[PDB]
Amino acid sequence: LDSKPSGNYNYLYRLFRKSKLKPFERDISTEIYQAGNKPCNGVAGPNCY
Amino acid sequence: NATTFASVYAWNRKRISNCVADYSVIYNFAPFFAFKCYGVSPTKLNDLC
């Protein structure tokens, strides 16, 4: 039922969030990635994971 | 900062240890094209043995 002949690429998962999660918490947002020894600003290019 | 490096086929090997890790002098150079840090986050080196 869940599998598709064209591939189910729409489903996602937020593995690379920065700070820690606590049990029974809700975290759904834009989740901009700001890491490295540089301000990424979401549009730089080096570290926009 | 050496005048002579090695070639791509005859890539050199240098083993250096028993020291202070000193991850601060490696950021001396500005025009770094790539600073890829797969596996270990680039700011969490200074507390690992």
Secondary structure layout plus pairing:
This is part of a larger assembly, with 2 copies of chain A (49 residues).
Chain A: no helix or strand
In brief, what are we looking at here?
The PDB classes it as viral protein/hydrolase. The entry lists the keywords SARS-CoV-2, XBB.1.5, ACE2, spike protein, viral protein/hydrolase, VIRAL PROTEIN-HYDROLASE complex. With 49 residues, chain A is low in regular secondary structure.
Describe it for me?
The structure is cut from a larger assembly and holds two copies of chain A (49 residues). The first copy, chain A, has 49 residues and is mostly loops. Chain A has no helices and no strands. The interface between A and B is small, with 3 and 4 residues.
Relevant terms:
XBB.1.5, part of a larger assembly, viral protein/hydrolase, ACE2, Spike protein S1 (chain A), little secondary structure, 49 residues, SARS-CoV-2, 2 chains
